[PDB]
Amino acid sequence: SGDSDEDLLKAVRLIKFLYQSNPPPNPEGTRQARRNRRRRWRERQRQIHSISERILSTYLG
């Protein structure tokens, strides 16, 4: 119970930190770079999402 409860808290705190390591790009002016930056940002968000979904599923049964 308590070991698994702590792990789940540690896992969610890690998931939140991963989302916080992928902040949205700030220029809002294109510039082909802003387009390349957003594509790069989206790939990383989809990846953090699947990791989170998978990590969490291990705690759900």
Epitope: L14, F17, S21
Partner: antibody, heavy 117, light 110 residues
């Protein structure tokens, strides 16, 4: 580019606290899993634990908890053996996960720890 | 918690033969599976990642596959340089069941 070097491997008496260090260099990434893997002579690989470098998120194998402490530094990741036993005799490797996908792409050459009474 | 049961413990195959190495996961790991090659005195080398993807710089003869709980490492045309010990790595550090290596497979070439 990406490089891992482990140091601290010594001959220790059982119960003598020992710290191993993984020198982390050439990584473009800020946050990534830095894992500790051990191998007793003539035996298989065993996962000890990992830390996600940007954070303080430590994860240990069921058998490793209490006996090992992984600590993160600016340019290093350490593995402290709180109270080693003869069963802890192994080469200790550090391995980095460069994608966050779970697999180990970069390894250090290893550091040998001998625990004898 | 996660246990990776690796079979067989040892395999002897002649040059050009096919080698099949299996890993059974005690829990559902999905694509959280990788294969490694280790030669004496050296650290392990990544062969397969995400269960079925060939790692960069690895010969095309190395094949990875997975269905549910069962994972397979196939070496189609075994070469003399493939004499080593092989390991699977399942799970994830932050998963409830952690991450774990299989017991390994020692490959000898005839």
């Amino acid at each position: 580019q990406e490089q891992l070097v482990e140091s601290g491997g010594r001959l220790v008496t059982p119960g003598t606290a020992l710290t191993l260090t993984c020198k982390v260099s050439g990584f473009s990434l800020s946050g990534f899993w830095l894992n500790w893997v051990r191998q007793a002579p003539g035996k298989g690989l065993e996962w000890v634990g990992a830390i996600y470098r940007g954070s303080g998120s430590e994860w240990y194998a069921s058998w490793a908890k209490g006996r090992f402490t992984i600590s993160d530094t600016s340019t290093t990741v350490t593995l402290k053996l709180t109270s080693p036993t003869t069963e802890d005799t192994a080469t200790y490797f550090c391995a980095a996960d460069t994608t966050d996908n779970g697999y180990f792409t970069i390894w250090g050459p290893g550091t040998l720890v001998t625990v004898s009474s | 918690e996660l246990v990776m049961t690796q079979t067989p413990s040892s395999v002897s195959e002649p040059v050009g033969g096919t080698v099949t190495i299996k890993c059974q996961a005690s829990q559902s790991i999905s694509s959280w599976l990788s294969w490694y090659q280790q030669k004496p005195g050296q650290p392990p080398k990544l062969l397969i990642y995400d269960a079925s993807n060939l790692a960069s710089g690895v010969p095309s003869r190395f094949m990875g596959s997975g269905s549910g709980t069962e994972y397979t490492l196939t070496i189609s045309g075994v070469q003399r340089e493939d004499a080593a010990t092989y390991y699977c790595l399942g799970g994830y550090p932050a998963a409830s069941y952690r991450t774990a290596f299989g017991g390994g497979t020692e490959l000898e070439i005839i």
